[PDB]
Every structure is written in C-alpha cells, then in structure tokens.
Symmetry: C2
Subunit: 359 residues, 2 copies
C-alpha cells in the first residue's frame, strides 16, 4: 500500500521506469527518493513524475557517502513509513537504502536480483550480495539467477523469477522516443537511406590496440564495398583520439558511405538502434538492447558479457576477424528476426508490482 523507491543513477531510473509506470495504474501510495545534474530533465524525457525527495549526498568519501545517505534516507523513511522499499542495482545508494529499511524493520525488494560476477573485489559485487541478503522480495530475472540466490541459502519463497525490466523499459522508452519531435528532428537529420548499419566501438581492448583497431576499420570498409550500405557511427572522445592517433580517422572521414556523429542521448540512440538493419558493437549494453529490439547484432569481441544473446541467435561473435565479420553479416542480413528473448517477456514492471500488491 505504501511503497518507497530508492534510486541514485540513470541505469537505475531506466530499469525502474516500468515499475513506476505500472504503479501509476494501481491505487498503491508510492514515492521516489533520488540521491545525487539534478536529474529533472531525464525524468521528464521518460514521461516520469519528478521524485518527491531529492537528497544531495554531495561528494566525499565512500564511508561518508554511505553514512550521509544512511542518515538522510532514514529521516525520509521515518517520515513516510512505507511497507516496502524497492531498489534496483548495486550502487552505494541501493545498499544504503536497503540497510536503513532493514533496520527500520521495513521489507525490502531487490529488482533484478541474483546476478554475480563471483569477483568479490569490485565493491559492487559486495553491494549485490549484501542487498540480496537483506531483502524480503528477490525479483530474479532468470532461473540461473534464482539458483545463485539459492546456493546462498536464500529462502526459495522469497525468490520470484519475473524476467528483466530492461525489456519493458527498452520497449516503453522506445515508444516515448518515437513521439519526441525534438529527437525525431535529430534522427531524421542523420538517417538518409531506409537502410543503415549502426556501429559503436569503445572497449579499451579494441581502441588502444592499434592492430585490432586498424583491422576492424578495414573490416567495416570491406562490409561497405560489398553491401553498399550506410554506416552510422556515434563516436565518444576517446575513440576519435585513438583514431587520429593511429592514422585511421582520416580514412573514415573519407569514405562517403560512412556517416559520423557526436555522441547522443538515451532516446536518440534508442531511435538509432530500433531502425537499424543490423548493429555492430563491442558494448554488452548495446547487445542487450538490440536483442530486445529485434535487431540483428554483430559483436566485435571474442568473449561477451551477455552471451545469452548469442545463445538465442540474436548475436554472433566475430572479434577482430574480417572473415568472421563478412560471414556474420551474411547470416544476420538474412536472419528471420524471431529469437526468443533471453531477458523476459516484457511485462516485468507490472508483474513485480502485482507480486508486491500480494505480499
């Protein structure tokens, strides 16, 4: 009946927006505690109501960050007295909120629970583990996730496999990006032909290494001269650095079939992803989104942090290789786009809110 969502980042806001959107179609009394740009503009691009509470934690040490939110989040939860505190992810905000709620005897729900890198060195893995172990509702995305939570002695009746809300989120936010004439402006001001490949490249293992970078660039060229297809390239500062450095950038400015752009925003880039014919990337995020958006994906790495996309057929791993690349492109351009979605059916915000309604 009363529900408090504690968040502190944008990937958090995105994955939680389907939970927020479901909440507006229930009679549950709910609110958001945002921690820290004061993210107003972002909440508005996503048609999301502004957070009732913004808490500036300011900067300072790990210890003081966590402590200041423990104190502040506590003053809010003492005032608001909710029944559930919902958190997603693994930042210091998430653990702080979960800790406070747990000490105030408030039930906590962890959205997208059960992921593990089994590298208990990055502070985020710890965050994940602690937060999961103080949680009453564990909304695990996959069975595998559930089994993780299970090898950790976490009571089976606390675990709910409900898929990932990144599916809901990516779908909904896409629809929102479509109705945005400010960004439809931009989209139409870059895309020429009804056919383009969208390419992103950023991993250090690729841009630092002059070899792999040269290789990949030439790969793109072979792809172009074969398929005579426009490539759109959003390019972060680091890459352009490594390209003017390795004497490759000029070759790219040259090729009139390649269209280069300054980096863009969440929704613009969602537009660019949905309407691509295939996507070429090193980012695990982009692999995920393409798979969700039913766009074929080719990955310029040899290992992937989202291997499930390869398992369903949405994704293929070519790494550095130009033959693997040409071969992949052949397969993906003629790919009937109906892979099973390994991340879920796209109704997880609603389902999570239903399960919370039950309790």
């Amino acid at each position: 009946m009363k529900l408090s969502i504690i968040l502190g980042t944008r990937p958090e806001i995105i994955k939680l927006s389907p939970i927020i959107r479901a909440l507006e179609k229930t009679n549950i009394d709910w609110h958001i505690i945002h921690t820290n740009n004061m993210d107003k503009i972002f909440f508005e691009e996503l048609n999301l109501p502004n957070p009732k509470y913004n808490l500036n934690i300011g900067s300072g040490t790990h210890g003081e960050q966590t402590g200041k939110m423990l104190i502040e989040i506590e003053k809010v939860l003492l005032k608001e007295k909710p029944d559930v505190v919902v958190v997603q992810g693994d930042t210091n905000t998430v653990l702080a909120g979960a800790l406070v709620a747990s000490k105030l005897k408030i039930d906590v729900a962890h959205v997208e629970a059960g992921l593990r890198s089994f590298d208990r060195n990055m502070p985020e893995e710890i965050n994940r583990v602690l937060t999961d172990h103080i949680s009453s509702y564990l909304f695990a995305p996959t069975e595998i996730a559930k089994n993780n939570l299970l090898r950790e002695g976490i009571e089976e009746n606390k675990i709910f496999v409900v898929g990932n809300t990144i599916v809901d989120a990516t779908l909904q936010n896409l629809k929102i990006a479509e109705k945005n004439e400010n960004v439809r402006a931009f989209f139409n001001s870059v895309v020429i032909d009804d056919d383009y490949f969208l390419l992103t490249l950023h991993r250090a293992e690729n841009v630092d290494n002059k070899e792999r970078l040269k290789n990949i660039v030439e790969g793109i060229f072979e792809i172009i001269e074969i398929y005579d297809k426009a490539i759109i390239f959003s390019i972060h500062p680091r890459t352009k650095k490594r390209l003017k450095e390795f004497n490759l950038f000029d070759k790219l400015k040259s090729n009139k079939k390649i269209k280069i752009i300054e980096p863009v925003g969440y929704l613009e880039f969602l537009m660019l992803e949905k309407n691509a014919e295939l996507i070429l990337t090193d980012s695990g995020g982009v692999q995920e989104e393409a798979c969700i958006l039913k766009v074929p994906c080719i990955t310029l790495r040899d290992n992937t942090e989202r291997p499930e996309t390869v398992e369903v057929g949405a994704n293929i791993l070519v790494g550095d290789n130009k033959e693997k690349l040409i071969k992949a492109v052949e397969i993906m351009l003629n790919k009937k786009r109906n892979w099973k979605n390994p991340f879920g059916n796209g109704k997880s915000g609603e389902r999570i809110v239903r399960i919370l309604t039950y309790g």
Copy 2:
C-alpha cells in the same frame, strides 16, 4: 603485519582478549578501535592495553549510529592503513567496521563466524549475515558453523574451524580474577564452606510466572534440606521485585543455608563460578562458562540456547520440576568432571593469530 580490531561491547572485548593476548607475543603491529562509561576500567581488570582510538558515537538513531561510525572508523583506517580488520560478534559496530574495511579494500576477519538463529527479523542476525559475507577470513567455532557458512555459498578456503575464543577467554580471565586481591577480598567475604552451589535465575519465563517461581524456590529448599549445602544467590533487581511480589522473598531471607548477594562484576562472578560444586541457572551464558570451567551444571529451563552442554554431559535440563531437579543434583554431584569441551580446546586466540600471520 598491521592489524586493526574494531570493538564496541564488553562481550566483544572478552571474546577478543585471547586474540589481544596472543598479539602481544607476536611482532605484528596492531591496534584497537573502541566505540561507545568509557570502558578504561574494564580493559584494566583484564590486564588489557588501552585502545589507541576511542570513538564516541554518542547516541542517536540506528541510521546515524551506523553512519557516524562509518565516517569515523573510516578516518582511522585511512590513517592506519592495516592489512586486516578483525571484528567479533554482531553489533552495529561490527557491521560498520566490516563495511568500511571492505570499501577500503581491506581484508576482514570475523571471529566466531557462522552462528545463525535463522530469524532474519532481529537486526543482529542480519548483521551476522552481512558481516560474514563481506569477510575474507571466517573463523568458525564448529563444523556445524562451517556448514552454515557453506550453505551460503561462502568459499570453503575462507573458512577456518578454530573453536571458540570464549574458552581461552574464560580460562585466562579466571586466572586474572584469581590474582586480584580486591575481588579475592569479596569472594572470601561471601564464601564460608568449601562447598556451595551457585544459583542464578533471571529469565522472564521463570520470574514473571508466579507458579514456576514458587516451584523453583521450593525445589531449592528440598535440595538444601537434603544435601545441607550453602546456596549463593546473586540477585538482579528484577528478580527481587518478582520475589517480594509473589511472597517468596521472605522465605529466602529466612533459610540460613541460603546466602544472598547484590549482583557482581565479571571477574567476581567468574570466581564464584569456578569454585562452585555445581551451578544452577537459566542463563545460556552461565551454562557455557560452567561447561568451560569444568563445573557441573543444572538448568532450570526445558529448552536450552546452548544444548551442546547437555550433549557432552556437562549439563542437564530439569526445567520447573522438583523430581528432575533432585535427580539431576544426584547425578551432577557424583559426576566425574571430564566432559569434552564442545566449544574448543582453549587455544583459539593463538590459532586465529597464527592463521592471520599466514594469510
């Protein structure tokens, strides 16, 4: 090589004193962070060096307690830069210290790890679970403890079954209490005969309930008239309340074989325990100490929070019953006192310090 012990309570100080005493016989550079009487006098009764750092956390909310120590403990660990942070138990101090150390990338050791009540409602169980899951060294007292830590996916090579330091502690502190003429003064000023039973009674289930209380008092009387043996009775305010209330207290003042005393200190009471012929109690703590001290124990409850003492033969459960009591007394007064110690061999402070030396 550099070691930081974070503590905030007396049961903590006790269980850690064997670790401290071992440390004084190693070349390891070490210190104590004490959180909050400013416990100086206690550290001195136990022949323990004063804590380098005392941090007043003051009082305030759960959230602010934890936050203020996160901040303060952090300023110390930034200054001291140790390799290991050692904590024992499950207070807010323990979790705070473990959290800070974990975020500063310092290895954490949990002394007496793996205990579970499986009641994830009391904040202390949570504390236990979180602290264990952020720990590099888990010094579990028993195999059972290890199996707990194990059902929680905690890596087997982090677990070290090394027994409980309460054995070391109780033994050492007893020796210390013996050499204390201020308390040997008191001991000799209560004990008359070389034979006495020491009786403690405090549980609500016993003192609130007029029935069970009447029963037990009369039980004591039957025991007296049979064995003609002095009973020493340390009596907290609550009990004397419930005894003058239920018209029983006067009967106790009457019986000249019963000797009644105002409550006493750690070491005085350790003296009273060691030199008893048998001990009669409802406290799980006292059961533990008696078992460690090789003194037969009779427990006036029907269930015990330290059942292992019954398993080795040191302890028998009579509850309310006067026949069970008479029968127990018969068995215990003729008990060859060599039960296996279910808590460990009494060398755990040293062993823990050895294992920390290895790392």
